[PDB]
Amino acid sequence: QDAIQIIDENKHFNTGILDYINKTSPADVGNNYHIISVFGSQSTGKSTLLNRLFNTNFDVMDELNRQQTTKGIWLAYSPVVSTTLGHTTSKSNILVMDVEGTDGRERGEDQDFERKAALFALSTSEVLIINIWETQVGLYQGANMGLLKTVFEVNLSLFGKSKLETHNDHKVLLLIVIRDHVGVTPVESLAKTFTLDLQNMWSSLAKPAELEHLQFADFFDVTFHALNHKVLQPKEFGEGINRLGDRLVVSNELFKPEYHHDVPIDGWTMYAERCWEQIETNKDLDLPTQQILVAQFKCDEIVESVFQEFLTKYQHHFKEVDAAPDFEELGALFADLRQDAFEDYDASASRYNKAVYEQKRKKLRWLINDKLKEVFDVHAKNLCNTLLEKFEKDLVALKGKDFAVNVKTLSTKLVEDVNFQVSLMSLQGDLSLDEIILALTKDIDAIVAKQQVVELNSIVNKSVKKLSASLSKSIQFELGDPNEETWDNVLQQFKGVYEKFGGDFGLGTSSTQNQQAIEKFKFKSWCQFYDVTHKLISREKLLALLQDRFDDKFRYDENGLPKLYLNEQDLEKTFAVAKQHALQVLPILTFAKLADGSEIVPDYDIFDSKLREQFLDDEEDHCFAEIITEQEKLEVLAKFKKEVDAKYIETKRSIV
Amino acid sequence: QDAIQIIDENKHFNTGILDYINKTSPADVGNNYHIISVFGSQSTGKSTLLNRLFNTNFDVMDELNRQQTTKGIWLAYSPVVSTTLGHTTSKSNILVMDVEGTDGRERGEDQDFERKAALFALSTSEVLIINIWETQVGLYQGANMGLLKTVFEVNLSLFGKSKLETHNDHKVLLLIVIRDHVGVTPVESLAKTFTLDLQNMWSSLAKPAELEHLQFADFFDVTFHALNHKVLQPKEFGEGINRLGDRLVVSNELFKPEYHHDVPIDGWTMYAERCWEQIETNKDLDLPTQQILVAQFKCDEIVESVFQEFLTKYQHHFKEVDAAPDFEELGALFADLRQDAFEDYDASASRYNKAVYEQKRKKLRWLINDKLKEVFDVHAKNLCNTLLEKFEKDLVALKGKDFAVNVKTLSTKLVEDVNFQVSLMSLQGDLSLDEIILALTKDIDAIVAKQQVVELNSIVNKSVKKLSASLSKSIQFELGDPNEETWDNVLQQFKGVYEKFGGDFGLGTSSTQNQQAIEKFKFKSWCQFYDVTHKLISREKLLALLQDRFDDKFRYDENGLPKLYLNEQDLEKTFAVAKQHALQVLPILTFAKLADGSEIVPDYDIFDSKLREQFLDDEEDHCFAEIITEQEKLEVLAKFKKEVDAKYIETKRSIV
Numbered sequence A, B: 001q002d003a004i005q006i007i008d009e010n011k012h013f014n015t016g017i018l019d020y021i022n023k024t025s026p027a028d029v030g031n032n033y034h035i036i037s038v039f040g041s042q043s044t045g046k047s048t049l050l051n052r053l054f055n056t057n058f059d060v061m062d063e064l065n066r067q068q069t070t071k072g073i074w075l076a077y078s079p080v081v082s083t084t085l086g087h088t089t090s091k092s093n094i095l096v097m098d099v100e101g102t103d104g105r106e107r108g109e110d111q112d113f114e115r116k117a118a119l120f121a122l123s124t125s126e127v128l129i130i131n132i133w134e135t136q137v138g139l140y141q142g143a144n145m146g147l148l149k150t151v152f153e154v155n156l157s158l159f160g161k162s163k164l165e166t167h168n169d170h171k172v173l174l175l176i177v178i179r180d181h182v183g184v185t186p187v188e189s190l191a192k193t194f195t196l197d198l199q200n201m202w203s204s205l206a207k208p209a210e211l212e213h214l215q216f217a218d219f220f221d222v223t224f225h226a227l228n229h230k231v232l233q234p235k236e237f238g239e240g241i242n243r244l245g246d247r248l249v250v251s252n253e254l255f256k257p258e259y260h261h262d263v264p265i266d267g268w269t270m271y272a273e274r275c276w277e278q279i280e281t282n283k284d285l286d287l288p289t290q291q292i293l294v295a296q297f298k299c300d301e302i303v304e305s306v307f308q309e310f311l312t313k314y315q316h317h318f319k320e321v322d323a324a325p326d327f328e329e330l331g332a333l334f335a336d337l338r339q340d341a342f343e344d345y346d347a348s349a350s351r352y353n354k355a356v357y358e359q360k361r362k363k364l365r366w367l368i369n370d371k372l373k374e375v376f377d378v379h380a381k382n383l384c385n386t387l388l389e390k391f392e393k394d395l396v397a398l399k400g401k402d403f404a405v406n407v408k409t410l411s412t413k414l415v416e417d418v419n420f421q422v423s424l425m426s427l428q429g430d431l432s433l434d435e436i437i438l439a440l441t442k443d444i445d446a447i448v449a450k451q452q453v454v455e456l457n458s459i460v461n462k463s464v465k466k467l468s469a470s471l472s473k474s475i476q477f478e479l480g481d482p483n484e485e486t487w488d489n490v491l492q493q494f495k496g497v498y499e500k501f502g503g504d505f506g507l508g509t510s511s512t513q514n515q516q517a518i519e520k521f522k523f524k525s526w527c528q529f530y531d532v533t534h535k536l537i538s539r540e541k542l543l544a545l546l547q548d549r550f551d552d553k554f555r556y557d558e559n560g561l562p563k564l565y566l567n568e569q570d571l572e573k574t575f576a577v578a579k580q581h582a583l584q585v586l587p588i589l590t591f592a593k594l595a596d597g598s599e600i601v602p603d604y605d606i607f608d609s610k611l612r613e614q615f616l617d618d619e620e621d622h623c624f625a626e627i628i629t630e631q632e633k634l635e636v637l638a639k640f641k642k643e644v645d646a647k648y649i650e651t652k653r654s655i656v
């Protein structure tokens, strides 16, 4: 017949509870019992009253030292209820829970466990006695109104939902008993106060909106019972209790079915543990206490001040973007700014909790790093764009001079360059270079790519100038001796240097495109080839072509000698030599051919402007090798004679 | 003989205090008085005890309703001190201050004014009575230990410094009187508790480091006096008081000189007001109360959770940089992310204070804007670089085609382009474009500047090709008739087109440099001029120059006829015609001149490589107009005859 702690100081809900309850009462407890408990400030004579109203045996404080006595929560079976008729047994089994008192000492700061044990009780009991001293009544934290708001609050947030399902719910009785009541002030007056206090507490709690409509009466009954001074009025104490004894068993006005959640005790013993789990570790209840709470707000106050003492002192160094930047001047002046602030902050918050102080210092640190990274980022990008120009120039300055072997060194040295120059400002690596260096590389590789296409096309364009050169030249040089083997010693160079285009670049491959450097090149050659022809040999240069050959015999002789004539027989003999010596190369070059009497074709369908501007036409195809149209063709031999026979009989004047 | 409120409820320190004090005591108060005051929880019978120990007339609560009675702070002059000898006058004037009680109701939440009035008292009084009920003793906020820590704390922070200057300081008496003391528990036991409580309170307060060494005893004396129940033990109440009456006047063990800060009352009446100002509005004291404090931490808890429910849900959409970006896909998916979070946060904190809830919602907003601006900034820059390439190409594609009139439209349309394309993502302008658009312009103006120099130099380079052209041509065309007026019809074009260089550009000025486009140009002409000469006319082309003229008579006749000879007289007559018809242009062109027989000079000191590569030499200056050196000069007339007289008598073979 000793009690047990359902829950011990350090929160362990108890196993043998169900067991225990049954081993006390010889009867079978069914849906036949009540659950009653006590709440209040430490040493208000709670255990005392449970021992005296029911007839339990909890421990009470011996009056030698005013100290905490109940620890955790306890449960006992009431043998009998003290009443005016003396001792009385009851119908139902009355199970009583004695809670450790709220407040004072020992646990003076951390109201963790008092918020919790209170709520357990509030949540598990049909009747809750709120045991206050009459003198605490008009008080706030004296009346405990602060640990109340909360419990009732987390109560509603946590179990308020279970309603509207209609029982036989937890309506619960708030049976608020005033202690050491002298009598001067009528309990009815005390009652009006503490209910108003309870009503007030109610409009105050935070309420999930489904229940924003819910009132305190909906969840809760209140009633009051005053006791006289136990020490100075011992008789009128005992009678006051008795009177309360009668209240709950005799009158039977106190327990009602609304509070009994209506299932057998094993049910309750499980329902408690469930509520206990949900309670023991709640978020809403999980709270650091004041010192901390208040050291948070205090340090946040100091930050905004020290930081606003930082801002407009930076609106001043940096409202103007520095004209003459130095990265040692900057980085150092950064440190200084941030030094100033720390000490000032530290001269105001090294008082408070270290951890909070510390946490709120790092908050300050990074508030200012971020205002410094704006500035640093500006000059970081200015430096880069500048440095990047040089570099681009640098690449251009070198002009095909072993590209990739110069991409390596210069690009390397630039990245290195910034990573040194900037890091002088990174405040100890506080400010990062990672994203800058990254954005550099990207801008680097952007350049080479665009300068690579320029070195790629310059290489082609200057490969088509040591080709239109030795090409358009050995067109003529061979032509001082019209041969079977003209084109034999012409394409055997037109293709002796046509091939050595690829592999010589030195740049960096763009390998498929390194490959496509050629199919512009070869298309271009196959287009200058035709352009040399249609320019080197046309109507005009054609009419001329006669005398070029015509006159190295028609008027010179033997060993480079001007031809000395004899009879009209040595004059009328070296004239028909010319009537063919005017026509004897043309068969080699009427439509330009090879050495095998077959037509020359272009590698591409060209005159078509749909293949044209991939590299920058009549009926059949204004033929490729058609140097001269069939009509301008003999518009040369409509003037073969006009001037050549103007020289045979027209210079027959001499022999005269 | 009524009291006055030195300070009223709403903090107004009182003017007529000094006045008042003197009008009570008929004697002159000098350094002859004490200042005594009371502190404690509401309705602990404080005013009652001041009325009874001194013999004042403060108001007391009528016992009908338990409510607040003292408002603000009051001061009265004690007529006499109740003692065991009855009523007793004292030597010094005893001035008593009655404070409104701490806690409960009315002002239930805001402990602003109770922190303050307490401190005033703590700071201004030689003796402070801490009036607690015996039952509050082992309590915490019951014993008021919470408003204590603070006051003592802000006390030390605010006046602790004034020490070490050695007086006659404010040591102050903590005269702590226990009320309704039944007797069961020995006051000496109660005393040990509440001093330990006071000592504890002391190690707890935040202490500026100069005073980190300071103890509670250094600043403070404590002593205790218990009173019996006033209502139930009226006699033993009165005797208890008396006993205390004796304590302070008779025994005279209670006031001591250490507490009296030792200056005339007018001094005190000023010293109070000073302390009052410093107190009335203190930062350290300025505190919002719990509800708020606790709604701050609660919402911060929710942020980190809703935000960490945001982060790694973004580590997931954006760990990969999107391959196929769409700015409507993005901006919308941004909104969504931020929508999710708000509602979740709002489903957890719409409970708490709006303002805090609201403030901590904007904190959440911008926490996520900043994680979204990273992403947005990436795609913002990708889009730009791309768009910028096209643009650069675009500029190149146009090639001198009315530059500035095309800078206008394209640049305009690009800026517009991004400002539309990006703004689709700016979440309602939440994310700013200001810095992007700015960085665009800079990159735009960087391009034109670099492409302007390319159009500037291409213009020059292609202005020096319609010059080396019609120039190097009308060198010869004139030369088919060597004249007095050769150079008259040569520079009158060499300078007929030399001038029309500037004003035709169309680009955009770079006006001083638009001007400097020319001084490359004119230096280049003054360098191709010499290069045409030293190439068009040199040792080789020279040897040749003879026959060019030599053969249009030495062998042709009259009307383009090959010269029919007669006697050796018509053969030995048109030979000396050539001995000068080989030399008759040279006087026009030995050193190349004008029409006035004076030397031609270059506009610049040229062969010098120190003026050279601003645009890309013997003894005197390897003379400018020195087409041929004095030695190669007649190395032409060491071969004038070698071949020309090889044709006069060498082709005397014919007439044979």
Ligand SMILES: Nc1nc2c(ncn2[C@@H]2O[C@H](COP(=O)(O)OP(=O)(O)NP(=O)(O)O)[C@@H](O)[C@H]2O)c(=O)[nH]1
Pocket (backbone or CB within 6 Å): A041, A042, A043, A044, A045, A046, A047, A048, A049, A059, A060, A061, A062, A063, A067, A068, A069, A070, A071, A099, A100, A101, A102, A179, A180, A227, A228, A229, A230, A231, B182
């Ligand atoms: N003046 C007075 N004293 C009382 C009254 N009731 C009990 N006491 C005494 O006050 C002390 C309180 O002991 P107890 O009843 O154990 O207090 P409690 O509420 O259990 N506090 P806790 O368990 O939190 O430590 C006891 O010594 C008891 O004798 C009362 O109504 N008036």
Ligand SMILES: Nc1nc2c(ncn2[C@@H]2O[C@H](COP(=O)(O)OP(=O)(O)NP(=O)(O)O)[C@@H](O)[C@H]2O)c(=O)[nH]1
Pocket (backbone or CB within 6 Å): A182, B041, B042, B043, B044, B045, B046, B047, B048, B049, B059, B060, B061, B062, B063, B067, B068, B069, B070, B071, B099, B100, B101, B102, B179, B180, B227, B228, B229, B230, B231
């Ligand atoms: N039981 C008890 N009652 C007391 C005692 N002293 C005074 N009272 C009664 O308690 C009530 C307190 O009134 P008062 O003395 O004005 O209280 P107070 O400390 O001025 N509070 P406040 O001024 O803050 O409103 C009075 O009605 C008085 O009769 C005491 O020692 N024990």
Ligand SMILES: [Mg+2]
Pocket (backbone or CB within 6 Å): A046, A047, A048, A058, A059, A060, A069, A070, A098, A099, A100, A101
């Ligand atoms: Mg107990």
Ligand SMILES: [Mg+2]
Pocket (backbone or CB within 6 Å): B046, B047, B048, B058, B059, B060, B069, B070, B098, B099, B100, B101
């Ligand atoms: Mg009062």
